[PDB]
Amino acid sequence: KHRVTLRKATLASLMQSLSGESSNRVMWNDRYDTLLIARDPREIKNAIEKSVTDFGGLENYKELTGGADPFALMTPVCGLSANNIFKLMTEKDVPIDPTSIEYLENTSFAEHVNTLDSHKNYVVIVNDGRLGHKFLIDLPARTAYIIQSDLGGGALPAVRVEDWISRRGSDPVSLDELNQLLSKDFSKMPDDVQTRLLASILQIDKDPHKVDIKKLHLDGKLRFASHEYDFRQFQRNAQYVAGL
């Protein structure tokens, strides 16, 4: 099969489009209760204009809101990226709210993968309380891939989703290594084991030195949720966003 080649092309063409106004806005809107592909680039733009008008103009909006021009192309934080890309992959005609879906708390990653169906595609959304980090694990029909973004500030360095995708988005990651990360046990692992796993799974250069386990919240809660997806449908949804 040629799923991986197509997946790479699909993710590529999608990422390239994101420097385009309408594509960026539809991709990284944070309303999760309607179909992502139903997001209208002019509706969103009107909403921003309105919001700015309400704050007495752009100058004043920026002054009160931190300095951000809300018209600018967005570099998504990890939650916004994970949520939206999850939406894009799983949605057909029924809105999926990734913030409202049920998450698993008392089952390990190995437990769950073993129960998933073999000829089906799944994407897993991970909320890692130890890293303070959301990211996706893609499981096409075993082999896994990481989709993520990161503004930094925690154990891991900043990484734009575009860069991550381009350099590591098709980099198969070990299920085995993945289980060791996604485990209550991970918190009490030696500094170098932790560092090594983080770099290996989540750092763009596989580099221990860019990781800082002193920023881990060791009493963190690990939660994740998986969802089946139609691969062709994922391509559909991606093509739509890229085509704006």
Which residues form the catalytic set?
Answer: 78, 133, 148
Separation of alpha carbons 80 and 168, rounded Å: 19
Q: Are strands 121-128 and 133-139 parallel, antiparallel or unpaired?
A: antiparallel
Separation of alpha carbons 244 and 239, rounded Å: 9
Q: Contact, 136 vs 128, CB < 8 A? A: no
Burial 36-46 (b: 16+ CB within 10 A, else e): bbebebeebee
Task: Please compute Rg for the chain using Cα positions.
Answer: 18
Give, rounded to a whole angstrom, the gap between the first and last alpha carbons of the chain: 30
